[PDB]
Amino acid sequence: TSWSDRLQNAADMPANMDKHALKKYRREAYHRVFVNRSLAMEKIKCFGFNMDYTLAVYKSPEYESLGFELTVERLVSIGYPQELLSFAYDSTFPTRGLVFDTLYGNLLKVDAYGNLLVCAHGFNFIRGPETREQYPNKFIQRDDTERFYILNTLFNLPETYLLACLVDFFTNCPRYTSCETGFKDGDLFMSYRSMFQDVRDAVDWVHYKGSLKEKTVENLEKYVVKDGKLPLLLSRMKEVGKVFLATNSDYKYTDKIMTYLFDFPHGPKPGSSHRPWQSYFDLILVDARKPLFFGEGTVLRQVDTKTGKLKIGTYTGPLQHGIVYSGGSSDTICDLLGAKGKDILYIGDHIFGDILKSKKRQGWRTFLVIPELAQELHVWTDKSSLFEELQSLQRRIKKVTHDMDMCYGMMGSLFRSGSRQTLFASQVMRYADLYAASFINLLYYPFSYLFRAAHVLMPHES
Amino acid sequence: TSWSDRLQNAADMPANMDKHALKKYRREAYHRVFVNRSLAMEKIKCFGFNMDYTLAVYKSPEYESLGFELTVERLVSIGYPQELLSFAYDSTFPTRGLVFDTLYGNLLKVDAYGNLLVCAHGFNFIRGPETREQYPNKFIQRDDTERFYILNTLFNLPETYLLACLVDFFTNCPRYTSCETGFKDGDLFMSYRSMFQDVRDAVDWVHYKGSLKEKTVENLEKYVVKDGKLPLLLSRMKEVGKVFLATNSDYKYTDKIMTYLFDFPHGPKPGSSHRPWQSYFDLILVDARKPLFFGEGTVLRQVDTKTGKLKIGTYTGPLQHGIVYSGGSSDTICDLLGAKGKDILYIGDHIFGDILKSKKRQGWRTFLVIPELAQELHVWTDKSSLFEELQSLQRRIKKVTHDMDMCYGMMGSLFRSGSRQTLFASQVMRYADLYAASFINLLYYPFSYLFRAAHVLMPHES
Numbered sequence: 001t002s003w004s005d006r007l008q009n010a011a012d013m014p015a016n017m018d019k020h021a022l023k024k025y026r027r028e029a030y031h032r033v034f035v036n037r038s039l040a041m042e043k044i045k046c047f048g049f050n051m052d053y054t055l056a057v058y059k060s061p062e063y064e065s066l067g068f069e070l071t072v073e074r075l076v077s078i079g080y081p082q083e084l085l086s087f088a089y090d091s092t093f094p095t096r097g098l099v100f101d102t103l104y105g106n107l108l109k110v111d112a113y114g115n116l117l118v119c120a121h122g123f124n125f126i127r128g129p130e131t132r133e134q135y136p137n138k139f140i141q142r143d144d145t146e147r148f149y150i151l152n153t154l155f156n157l158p159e160t161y162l163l164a165c166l167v168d169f170f171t172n173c174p175r176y177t178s179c180e181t182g183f184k185d186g187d188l189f190m191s192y193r194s195m196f197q198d199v200r201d202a203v204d205w206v207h208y209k210g211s212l213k214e215k216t217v218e219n220l221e222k223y224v225v226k227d228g229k230l231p232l233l234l235s236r237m238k239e240v241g242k243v244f245l246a247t248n249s250d251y252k253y254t255d256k257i258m259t260y261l262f263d264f265p266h267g268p269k270p271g272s273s274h275r276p277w278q279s280y281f282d283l284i285l286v287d288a289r290k291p292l293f294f295g296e297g298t299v300l301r302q303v304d305t306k307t308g309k310l311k312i313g314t315y316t317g318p319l320q321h322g323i324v325y326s327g328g329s330s331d332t333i334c335d336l337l338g339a340k341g342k343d344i345l346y347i348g349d350h351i352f353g354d355i356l357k358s359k360k361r362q363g364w365r366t367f368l369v370i371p372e373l374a375q376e377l378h379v380w381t382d383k384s385s386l387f388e389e390l391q392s393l394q395r396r397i398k399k400v401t402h403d404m405d406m407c408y409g410m411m412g413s414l415f416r417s418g419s420r421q422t423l424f425a426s427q428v429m430r431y432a433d434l435y436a437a438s439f440i441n442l443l444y445y446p447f448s449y450l451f452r453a454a455h456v457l458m459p460h461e462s
Numbered sequence: 463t464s465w466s467d468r469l470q471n472a473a474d475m476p477a478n479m480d481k482h483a484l485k486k487y488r489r490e491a492y493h494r495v496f497v498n499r500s501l502a503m504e505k506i507k508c509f510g511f512n513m514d515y516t517l518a519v520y521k522s523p524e525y526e527s528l529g530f531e532l533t534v535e536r537l538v539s540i541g542y543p544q545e546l547l548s549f550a551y552d553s554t555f556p557t558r559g560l561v562f563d564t565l566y567g568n569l570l571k572v573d574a575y576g577n578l579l580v581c582a583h584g585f586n587f588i589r590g591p592e593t594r595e596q597y598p599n600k601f602i603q604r605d606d607t608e609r610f611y612i613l614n615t616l617f618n619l620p621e622t623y624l625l626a627c628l629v630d631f632f633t634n635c636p637r638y639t640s641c642e643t644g645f646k647d648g649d650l651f652m653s654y655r656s657m658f659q660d661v662r663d664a665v666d667w668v669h670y671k672g673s674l675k676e677k678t679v680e681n682l683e684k685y686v687v688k689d690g691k692l693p694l695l696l697s698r699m700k701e702v703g704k705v706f707l708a709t710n711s712d713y714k715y716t717d718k719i720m721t722y723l724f725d726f727p728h729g730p731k732p733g734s735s736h737r738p739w740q741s742y743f744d745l746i747l748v749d750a751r752k753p754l755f756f757g758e759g760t761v762l763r764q765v766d767t768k769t770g771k772l773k774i775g776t777y778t779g780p781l782q783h784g785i786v787y788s789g790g791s792s793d794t795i796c797d798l799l800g801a802k803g804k805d806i807l808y809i810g811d812h813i814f815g816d817i818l819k820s821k822k823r824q825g826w827r828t829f830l831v832i833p834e835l836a837q838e839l840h841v842w843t844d845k846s847s848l849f850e851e852l853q854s855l856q857r858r859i860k861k862v863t864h865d866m867d868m869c870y871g872m873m874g875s876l877f878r879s880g881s882r883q884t885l886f887a888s889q890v891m892r893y894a895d896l897y898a899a900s901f902i903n904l905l906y907y908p909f910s911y912l913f914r915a916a917h918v919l920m921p922h923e924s
C-alpha cells in the first residue's frame with residue numbers, strides 16, 4: 001500500500017456533498033486540511049494550480065520505477081558499465097528532501113540548521129562517531145549550493161536511489177579504487193561531483209529528450225491517479241473566484257495529461273454534460289520556468305493550440321477566451337486576473353519552486369500538497385506508541401528512534417528522525433499556510449471557512 | 463527609566479552566590495535566560511564575546527543623543543540646511559529593527575513575511591487603506607536589499623529618528639517641493655535614496671573619522687554601563703572553559719573601553735587583586751569585520767599593543783600569551799582554541815552579524831543580548847491586561863492594538879504590534895538558542911545547567 005494506492009482509493013469514492021457528511025469526512029486526518037497560519041477562505045479570489053504531482057499525481061512505485069529504468073538506460077548508453085542494468089528501483093530506500101554531498105558522495109538527512117540526522121554512503125549507514133571524520137561539527141553549510149544538492153521533489157526519488165546504487169556499485173567493484181572524493185579507474189578519475197552531474201543530466205534528458213513522457217501518456221491508467229471529484233472541486237472554485245494553471249510542463253504534454261484527468265462520461269457531477277479541461281480555467285500558462293517565474297520571469301509568448309508550437313514574437317495582447325500563454329511572470333497572472341498576492345491561493349507540490357518562492361517573492365497565500373502524507377499519516381497513528389515512548393524518555397533513545405524511523409523506510413519519515421524535525425518539515429511549517437495529502441481535501445470545507453492556527457508567543461511572553 | 467537605567471540598577475548590586483539566592487533571583491524575568499532551543503551548558507567549551515552593546519552597554523538616551531547630535535553636525539557641515547540644528551533626539555520615537563524604504567522615504571515595521579505592521583512617512587503614521595497606494599499587497603520584498611534597509615542595531619537608533627526628522631522637515635518646508643521619490647529644490651533633486659545614503663555615510667563618519675569615540679571615552683560614567691559582576695562571571699567561565707573576544711572595533715578603542723569596564727579596586731571578587739582586562743581572555747581579536755568574519759574573513763594580522771598599530775604582513779605564528787589578533791576568520795578562533803562550532807557559545811547583540819550568520823555559516827551555539835528587554839519586560843507585565851484582552855477578542859481590536867503599542871513608544875514593541883510578531887522577534891526565535899536582557903544573567907545558573915525548550919510538532923502530528 002503506497003501513498004498513491006491511498007490517494008487512488010479515496011479518488012474512487014463519489015462525493016457526498018451533504019453538509020454533515022462533509023464535516024464528518026474532514027475529521028479524518030487523511031481528508032483534512034492542516035493549518036500553519038490562519039487563512040480566511042472568503043478572502044481568496046484566485047485559486048492557482050500546477051499540474052505535475054498536484055493535479056496529476058503519478059502512481060508509486062510504477063512511475064519512479066519507469067524514471068529509474070530510463071535514467072539507467074541513458075547512463076549505460078553514454079558509457080556507464082553494463083552492471084547498472086542489474087539495478088532495480090527500491091521504493092523502501094529513498095525518502096524525499098535528502099541532500100547529496102557531491103564532495104564525499106553521501107546522502108544526508110538534515111535539520112533546518114544543517115545538523116546531520118542520517119548519513120549514508122551507498123547503502124552503508126554511518127553512525128554518529130564515524131561521521132565526524134568528514135563532518136567535524138556534524139553540520140553542513142547549506143549556502144554551499146555547489147557542494148550540496150537538495151532533492152526536493154517526487155521527480156527526484158529515482159535519482160535519490162540511483163545515487164546510492166552507483167556509490168555502492170563503484171565501492172564494491174574491484175575494477176575501481178575508492179578515494180575520498182570519487183573513484184579511480186586506471187588513468188580515469190570519476191569524482192562524486194561529476195557522477196552526480198551525469199545522473200542529473202540523464203534525469204533531465206529522460207524527461208525532455210527521452211521516452212518518459214511518451215511511455216507515461218501511452219498508459220495513463222498505470223501511471224496517473226484519476227479522480228471524478230477533480231472537476232467538481234474546480235467548478236466550485238470557479239463559482240466563487242477565478243482559477244488558473246501555471247505549469248513548468250509544455251502545452252502538448254499538459255493537454256494529454258489534463259484531457260485524461262477530465263475524461264469521464266460527465267462534467268463536474270454525474271448526469272452533467274462533459275466539458276473540455278480548458279473551460280475550467282480563467283488563465284492557462286505553460287513553460288512557467290518557476291521559480292524564475294516569481295522574479296523577472298521570461299518573455300510572454302502565445303501558444304498556437306492547433307500545432308502545439310509557440311507563435312513567433314512576444315505576446316502584447318489582452319486576456320482572451322481560449323488563449324494559452326507560455327513563459328511570462330507571476331505579474332502576468334496578477335495583472336490579467338486583477339489580483340493582489342494575498343487574493344491568491346497557489347496550490348503546489350514543490351516546496352522551493354512553488355511555495356517558498358511565491359511566499360517570499362510575492363506574498364501569495366500557499367497550499368502545499370504532500371502526496372506521501374496519505375501513507376505517513378497511517379504510520380504516524382499506527383505507531384503512535386513508539387513516538388509516545390520517545391517523548392517520555394539514551395541508548396534506548398537511539399534504539400527507539402531507529403525503530404520508529406524504520407517504519408517509514410530506510411531513510412525515515414519525510415518530517416523527522418525521532419524527535420528531530422527535518423529541513424523539509426521546517427520549510428513546510430514556515431512557508432506553507434495550508435497543507436494536505438491532496439488539494440481535493442478543500443472539497444470538504446465550505447468556501448467561507450476560516451482555517452485557524454494559534455498565535456505564536458516568544459519564551460519571555462509565555 | 464530607560465532600559466539602561468534598569469541594567470545599571472541591577473549592575474550596582476553585589477553578587478550573592480549562595481546557591482538558593484541564585485535560584486530565587488533567576489526566577490524574575492529580568493534576571494532570567496530565555497530558551498528557544500535546548501542547550502546543555504556542560505557541552506560548552508568556549509565562551510565568545512563581542513564588546514559594543516554586549517560587554518559595553520551604552521547608556522540611553524545619552525549615547526543615542528550624542529550620536530544624533532554629531533551626525534546632524536556632520537550633515538550640516540557637508541551642506542544640509544541649518545534647520546537640522548534645531549532637531550533634538552527623541553527616544554520615544556524609534557524602535558529597533560525598522561526598515562527604511564529608500565524609494566518612498568518610509569519607515570516600516572514588518573513581520574517575517576514582509577507584511578506591513580506600521581508605516582510612517584516622517585511623523586505621519588499611515589493607516590491601512592492609505593498604505594495601499596504605495597504597497598498594493600501591504601507587503602515588501604525583503605530580498606530587494608538595494609531598496610530596503612533593515613536598522614538592526616542599537617547604533618542605528620539615532621539614524622532611525624533622524625530619517626523621520628529629515629522627511630518631516632523637507633515635506634513641511636516651503637523651499638522644497640515633495641515628489642513620490644524625494645524633494646525638488648529648484649534645479650536640485652534629492653531622492654530619499656540619496657538622502658538615506660548621506661545619513662548612513664555621516665553615521666559611519668562620526669564613528670570612524672569623527673569625535674564620537676573621543677567624547678565617549680572622555681566621560682565613560684555618563685556613556686557606559688559598568689558592573690562589578692562582569693569580572694566575576696568571566697573568571698567563572700574561564701574555570702570551566704576558554705573565553706574569547708571577537709570585536710568589530712579597533713584595538714585602541716577596545717583597550718580604553720575594556721580598561722574602564724574592569725576598573726574596580728579588586729579583581730573578580732572584592733578582596734582580590736585587580737588584574738588587567740586582557741588576562742580574562744584566552745584569545746583577543748579586533749577588527750573582526752563580522753559577518754564576513756564567518757565566511758572567508760580577512761587576512762590575519764597581529765596588533766602591536768604598544769603603538770596600537772598593526773604589524774606589517776600576515777601573521778603566520780601560533781597562539782602566544784599576550785598576542786592580540788586583527789581580522790582573520792571564525793576558523794582562526796576554532797583552530798587556535800581547538801574548538802568545533804557546537805563547543806562554542808557566542809554572545810552577541812547583532813541579530814544578523816553575530817547570531818544569524820554564526821548559526822547558519824558555522825553551526826555555533828548562540829546567545830543574544832537584547833538590552834531593551836530590561837524595560838520591555840516591565841511594560842509586558844505592567845500592561846498584561848491589554849494583551850490578555852486582545853487575545854480574548856474589530857475596530858476594538860485595532861484600538862486595543864494601538865493602545866498596547868503606544869505603551870512601548872511611537873513605533874511599538876521591538877517584538878510585536880498587537881498579535882502580530884515582528885521580523886526581529888522571528889529571527890530571535892529562529893537563530894538565538896538563548897536570549898536575555900544581559901549576558902550577566904548566566905551568572906545565576908550553574909555551569910552544568912540544561913536549558914530546555916519543548917519539542918516542536920507539526921499540525922498533523924498534534
Ligand SMILES: Nc1ncnc2c1ncn2[C@@H]1O[C@H](COP(=O)(O)OP(=O)(O)OP(=O)(O)O)[C@@H](O)[C@H]1O
Nearest residue numbers: 112113141142143144145150152351352356427822
Ligand atoms: N529547499 C530548497 N531547495 C533548493 N534551494 C533552497 C531550498 N531552501 C533554500 N534554498 C536556497 O539555498 C540557498 C542557501 O540556503 P540558506 O541556508 O543560506 O538560506 P535559507 O533558506 O534562507 O535558510 P533558512 O531556512 O535558515 O531561512 C539560498 O539561496 C536559499 O534560497
Ligand SMILES: Nc1ncnc2c1ncn2[C@@H]1O[C@H](COP(=O)(O)OP(=O)(O)OP(=O)(O)O)[C@@H](O)[C@H]1O
Nearest residue numbers: 360574575603604605606607612614813814818889
Ligand atoms: N536582519 C537582517 N539584516 C540584514 N540582512 C538580512 C537580515 N536578515 C536577512 N538578511 C539578508 O537579506 C537578504 C534578503 O532577505 P530574504 O528575505 O531573501 O532571506 P531570509 O533571511 O532567508 O528570509 P527568511 O527569514 O524567510 O528565512 C538575504 O541575503 C538575507 O541573508
Ligand SMILES: [Mg+2]
Nearest residue numbers: 050051052053
Ligand atoms: Mg508540480
Ligand SMILES: [Mg+2]
Nearest residue numbers: 512513514515
Ligand atoms: Mg556588539
Ligand SMILES: [Mg+2]
Nearest residue numbers: 360818822892
Ligand atoms: Mg532564510
